Design a protein around this ligand. Structure first.
Ligand SMILES: Cc1cccc(N2CCN[C@H](C)C2)n1
Length: 175
């Protein structure tokens, strides 16, 4: 059972106009088997649009490619991004590239270390903010986690489930 193809794709932005299907593939095959690899071009001029896509055979290969950033492809540092659902987008077909998540449903007994221990395996955490009531100081049952990079957030929001401190949590991109 293969993971859905959408979860195995990387958009590669910022390409050199000299990058080709072949040179993009040669580069990105270092991190996995590529089932597809295309440079987007103008339909009339064939001039590169400056972005392309690669599709790996597995999600672990996507992760390996993302963990090997920064990627300098044909002399230019490119911008890889994995796909997320429309619910974590501001408009169809656009990526909301952010470093912060909202975590809801954690109630009053969840502490900073619960969030750190769980989320640190998705990326490097810079800020954990457990939200408390402005008047009483009581925990409100939600938090924000800020990472050093957007791929952590992208991996997080595409999971169907997050269980933190025994709670089934709602997690979404923030700001
Ligand atoms: C497959 C994938 C992953 C991440 C972003 C992304 N896109 C945003 C930039 N514009 C292209 C056409 C779509 N596509």
């Amino acid at each position: 059972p293969k993971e859905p193809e959408q979860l195995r794709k990387l958009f590669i932005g910022g390409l050199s106009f000299e990058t080709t299907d072949e040179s993009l593939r040669s580069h990105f095959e270092q991190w996995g088997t590529l089932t597809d690899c295309v440079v987007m071009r103008d339909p009339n001029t064939k001039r590169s649009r400056g972005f392309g896509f690669v599709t790996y055979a597995t999600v672990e290969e996507v992760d390996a490619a993302m963990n090997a950033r920064p990627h300098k492809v044909d002399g230019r540092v490119v911008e890889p991004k994995r796909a997320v659902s429309r619910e974590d987008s501001q408009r169809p077909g656009a990526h909301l590239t952010v470093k912060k998540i909202f975590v809801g449903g954690i109630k009053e007994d969840t502490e900073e270390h619960h969030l750190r221990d769980y989320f640190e395996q998705y990326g490097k955490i810079e800020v954990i903010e457990i939200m408390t009531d402005r008047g009483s100081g009581k925990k409100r049952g939600f938090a924000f986690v800020t990472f050093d990079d957007h791929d952590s957030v992208d991996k997080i929001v595409i999971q169907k489930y997050h269980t933190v401190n025994g709670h089934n949590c709602e997690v979404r991109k923030a700001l």
